[PDB]
Design a protein around this nucleic acid. Structure first.
Length: 1073
RNA sequence: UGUGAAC
């Protein structure tokens, strides 16, 4: 509840010259008291009278009613920031060293010197792209400083380290003044031209870094990064985090977790000697020297101090620095520069071609329906993203323009223009529009915004390839339901004194022009073999079209902006945007490693314990018939680099016997680490989400970083949420949502009142609020209705439906119409209409919570029903598992030590049910977990019609609707759906082993009947409650269940009518991955 | 309608 108290202090701190607490209650008489109190406060304020008497008079309202929000009557002129800043601006401003960056525009030159005229200006290279201002961030940091001004002992030290650092931001900012943002939170030319170009982005990165500073080490790191960053905007992250790849190889392994036959983590007390050739040390030194040549001093020394003994115990610092460098900011260059960087491949091409054949051999020979109806599948899959050009479109009786892919397909079909048989060119005549990918520390890459013809021609085939990968282990990122822990387990498994790991970064090779010929040719060669495997007209054409996309790309041309011009240049490299991007890249990366390993063996003899490709990295584990020496590692390494070199591939290739480092994860000293570099006050690009969506995302970002080792003060995060979630009523009237409105599990949830613990209404007022918020979940959009009524639209929905099913439509048909009515949300005008409606509904709701016919059951209601039938009792669970993920906070880590962890993802889509499998065999349609959930619970006769309506044969439809499996699917679908509603795969929970024997003992549930659904919820509810207590208290409890038999039948009915909740908090988890 | 592909 501390959030509400914190909000008042912040408002009082921000405004000084009134606040009006607004309450509400589920009890009629109490609510009137709430209404009376609100009126009196407004009246007293409208008379400059003391509200002290009213608070005493309506003590009962303060005591029992629930705080809904807070009114903010502030008559200033959004200044204060200018006034506040000066006290902290005593230090000497920073002077940009305009000689550090290559490309001139990457140097912190005055904005004007980069864009002499307002028409040449662009924030494209520094846009924070976030719906929160620099001024607000400054206010937030200062508010925190004032609060922890009179702190003591170590808390004071944290404040002192922070006050210093913020002085640098303040001193530098004051020298030019605080950049004023516009309604869209953008920084225009007039505000910008006086100040240094990167001033605002740099401030956001520095503020984010300093508020995440605690120990002296954090302070040393933050200070170096902040100062260096102001001048260097292109190699500081790379220089700072480059020594990590060398370091993982150094640390010794003293007991680590491995993967057993049951694909689960298991402790192994083994010891593995880290063997490092002297050459590696020279390479590490050059890296350290390079950091030094760039001004770095404190960070280089820390790596150096660590290097004396290299203890996994003092490794945390190395990890901390690696996470830290990313928070310098994104490297946003100019489209042209990002674009510009871009006989022995016979073995490599053949492998790519063979791999393509294996993944589609069976689907093609059989005459897979999905391959035959590939076009239909592409249409259903189709998104609402950009197609490339902004077309003029006529809907019903309205002429509007859009770039949306969904919109383009409908307009073309309604005008005989829809022609997926013809795969448009992407050369000099029809240049590919370009998109961009910005990441911290790494160089900017370009993106192909190809026409929808390409997505349809590639969607069915890519899915078939993914399915092959799903059950192929070499493909770490696609295998089974696995998570990163299993991958961590696999590398450690075979580590011994007679084996060495070989990791390699292949991000540069994928963009290499050397790469593109063997790539497209390899896929095409594979496609021809597949074509000679069948005669099916549908299969050959879908297969043939795929061949065409590769051929068109072979020689493409790109539209690269160059100021306010769009120079068209011949791009001869494999950029990404295709449907086969990830699958193809994976196939290629794996093919490349196989090629390198094969070449090397002619010289040395080793065993291939494991080979893996995961993202932009690939690796292998080799076993030699003798003990590995420093000399052996050098010889293997030189040859591997040499093999890569002959192929003209600029890749990083290292060889060790203890660790490995890759973009997604790193394994040092037998432990697993995950970079914690998600930026907070700076985004990659601008989207269409709201401020509330953004606040939820920032919190989500904060949670992931905190789990990964990077923690930003919670109070600062809370302060940001308060600014972001507020709503202006007028110019001097601002409304701030309460903790209850923000955290309760509703459609407006932004964060959990307590980190790592998700609460669900257990009081009437909480329930009353939850029901009210849902009442106004989805808002109307005129523009969306018009187009939803247009002919071209209905025909498109009708055309899709008549191509899919055979018999009758509606559970499926109603869905297709909506799925399409939604895709119109990418369309700004529609998105804008929805937001305005949401704010007005929200403004009224905060003012005085409306009524609601309810009648809609949710997850919270099911939980609320159960709660009262459990008896708690202190219990004890000894810690028995060693730590493998060193960065986890203490409360989260403790649960793992006691109950354990898992290496998989709980099925939350229902894709593993028989009905879903049956639909898949005959239909290209893909029902969601929710649709499957409604369908399974239907009358036997109805289910048979639905399966047949989708193309499922009668002998098959009939056999299923009675069988054991159908009854079983019922339980499995609900189980999958419930896990989905409980976020058992996100945040903290995704880590915990929900089937721990130790966890199980704490749950005593006596069966008083035997009805699967009820049994499953009671055990799950108990496991979550027991775990949450452990997260919040550190000690365990035992749960006993005395749930009636009469009660269980009522509960079971309730279970099959649960409504899913949509909210910023829900969206944020989806957003993360 | 400052809007920028596969996931």
């Amino acid at each position: 509840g501390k959030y509400n108290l914190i909000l008042s202090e912040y408002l009082s701190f921000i405004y000084n010259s009134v606040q009006i607490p607004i309450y509400y209650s589920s009890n009629s008489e109490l609510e009137n008291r709430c209404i009376e109190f609100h009126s009196k406060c407004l009246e007293n304020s409208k008379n400059g009278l003391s509200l002290r008497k009213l608070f005493v008079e309506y003590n009962d309202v303060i005591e029992n009613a629930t705080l809904l929000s807070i009114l903010s009557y502030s008559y200033d002129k959004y200044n204060a920031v200018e006034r506040k800043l000066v006290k902290y601006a005593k230090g000497k401003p920073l002077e940009a060293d305009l000689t550090v960056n290559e490309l001139d525009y990457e140097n912190n030159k005055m904005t004007s010197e980069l864009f002499p005229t307002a028409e040449e200006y662009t924030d494209s290279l520094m846009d924070p792209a976030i719906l929160t201002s620099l001024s607000s961030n400054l206010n937030a940091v200062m508010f925190w400083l004032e609060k922890h001004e009179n702190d003591v002992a170590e808390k004071l030290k944290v404040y002192k380290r922070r006050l210093d650092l913020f002085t640098i931001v303040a001193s530098t900012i004051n020298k030019y003044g605080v950049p004023r943002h516009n309604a869209k939170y953008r920084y225009e030319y007039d505000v910008m031209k006086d100040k240094p170009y990167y001033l605002v982005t740099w401030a956001n990165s520095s503020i984010e870094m300093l508020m995440s500073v605690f120990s002296h080490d954090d302070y040393l790191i933050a200070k170096e990064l902040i100062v260096l960053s102001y001048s260097n905007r292109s190699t500081l992250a790379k220089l700072v985090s480059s020594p990590m790849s060398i370091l993982v190889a150094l640390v010794d392994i003293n007991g680590t977790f491995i993967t057993n036959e049951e694909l689960e983590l298991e402790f192994s007390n083994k010891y593995v000697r880290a063997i490092v050739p002297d050459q590696t040390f020279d390479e590490l030194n050059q890296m350290l020297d390079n950091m030094r040549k760039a001004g770095l001093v404190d960070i280089p020394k820390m790596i150096q101090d660590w290097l004396v003994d290299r203890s996994i115990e003092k490794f945390p610092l190395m990890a901390k620095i690696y996470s830290w460098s990313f928070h310098v900011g994104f490297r946003k260059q100019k489209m042209l520069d990002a674009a510009l960087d871009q006989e022995m491949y016979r073995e490599y091409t053949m492998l790519i071609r063979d791999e393509v054949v294996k993944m589609l051999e069976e689907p093609v020979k059989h005459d897979d329906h999905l391959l035959r109806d590939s076009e239909l599948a592409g249409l259903l899959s189709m998104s609402s993203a950009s197609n490339g050009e902004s077309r003029q479109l006529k809907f019903g009786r309205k002429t509007i323009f859009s770039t949306k892919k969904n919109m383009h397909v409908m307009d073309d079909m309604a005008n005989e223009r829809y022609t997926p048989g013809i795969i448009p060119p992407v050369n000099v005549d029809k240049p590919i529009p370009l998109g961009r990918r910005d990441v911290p520390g790494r160089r900017t890459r370009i993106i192909f915004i190809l026409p929808y013809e390409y997505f349809i021609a590639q969607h069915a085939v890519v899915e078939k390839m993914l399915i092959y990968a799903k059950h192929t282990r070499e493909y770490a990122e696609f295998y089974s339901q696995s998570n990163q822990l299993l991958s961590y387990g696999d590398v450690t498994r075979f580590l011994s004194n007679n084996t060495m790991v070989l990791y390699t970064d292949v991000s540069q090779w994928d963009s290499s022009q050397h790469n593109t010929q063997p790539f497209r040719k390899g896929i095409i060669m594979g496609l021809d073999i597949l074509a000679n495997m069948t005669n099916d007209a549908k299969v050959l054409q879908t297969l043939n079209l795929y061949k065409q996309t590769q051929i068109n790309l072979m020689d493409s041309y790109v539209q690269i902006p160059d100021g306010n011009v769009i120079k068209k240049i011949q791009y001869g490299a494999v950029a990404s945007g295709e449907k086969q991007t990830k699958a193809a890249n994976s196939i290629a990366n794996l093919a490349l490693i196989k090629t390198v390993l094969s070449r090397i063996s002619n010289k040395h003899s080793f065993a291939t314990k494991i080979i893996r490709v995961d993202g932009d990295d690939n690796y292998a584990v080799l076993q030699f018939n003798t003990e590995v020496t420093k000399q052996m590692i050098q010889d293997v390494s030189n040859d591997v680099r040499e093999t890569y070199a002959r192929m003209n591939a600029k890749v990083k290739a290292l060889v060790s016997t203890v660790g490995i480092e890759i973009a997604k994860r790193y394994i040092a000293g037998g432990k697993i680490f995950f970079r914690a570099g998600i930026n907070l006050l700076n985004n990659e690009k601008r989207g269409q989400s709201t401020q509330w969506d953004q606040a939820a995302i920032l919190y989500s970002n904060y949670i992931v970083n905190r789990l990964r080792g990077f923690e930003t003060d919670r109070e600062f995060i809370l302060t940001k949420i308060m600014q972001m979630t507020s709503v202006a009523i007028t110019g001097s009237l601002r409304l701030f949502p309460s903790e209850r409105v923000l955290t309760t599990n509703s459609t407006f949830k932004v964060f959990d009142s307590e980190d790592f613990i998700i609460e669900y209404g257990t009081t009437v007022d909480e329930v009353y609020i939850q029901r009210a918020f849902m009442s106004l979940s989805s808002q109307k959009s005129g523009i969306a209705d018009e187009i939803a009524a247009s002919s071209t639209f209905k025909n498109y929905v009708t055309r899709l439906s008549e191509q899919l099913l055979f018999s009758k439509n509606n559970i499926v048909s109603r869905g297709i119409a909506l799925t399409e009515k939604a895709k119109l949300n990418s369309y700004a005008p529609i998105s804008l209409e929805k937001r305005r409606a949401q704010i007005s509904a929200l403004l009224t709701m905060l003012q005085k919570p409306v009524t609601f016919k309810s009648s809609k059951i949710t997850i919270n209601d099911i939980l609320r029903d159960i709660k009262p039938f459990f008896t708690v009792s202190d219990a004890h669970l000894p810690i028995q598992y060693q730590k493998f993920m060193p960065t986890l906070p203490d409360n989260v880590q403790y649960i793992i030590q006691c109950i354990g962890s898992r290496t998989y993802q709980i099925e939350d889509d229902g894709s593993k049910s028989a009905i879903s499998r049956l639909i898949s065999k005959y239909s290209v349609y893909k029902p969601s977990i929710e649709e499957l959930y409604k369908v399974i619970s239907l009358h036997e006769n109805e289910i048979q019609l639905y399966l047949i309506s989708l193309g499922i044969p009668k002998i098959d439809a009939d056999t299923y609707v009675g069988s054991k499996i159908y009854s079983r699917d019922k339980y499995r679908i609900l189980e999958s759906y419930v896990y989905n509603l409980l976020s058992i795969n996100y945040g903290c929970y995704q880590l915990f082993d929900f089937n721990s024997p130790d966890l199980e003992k704490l749950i005593r549930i006596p069966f008083k009947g035997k009805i699967p659904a009820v049994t499953f919820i009671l055990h799950l509810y108990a496991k979550l409650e027991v775990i949450n207590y452990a997260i919040k208290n550190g000690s365990w409890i035992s749960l006993f269940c005395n749930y009636p038999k009469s009660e269980m039948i009522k509960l079971w009915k309730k279970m099959w009518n649960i409504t899913s909740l949509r909210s910023p908090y829900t969206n944020a988890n989806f957003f993360q991955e």
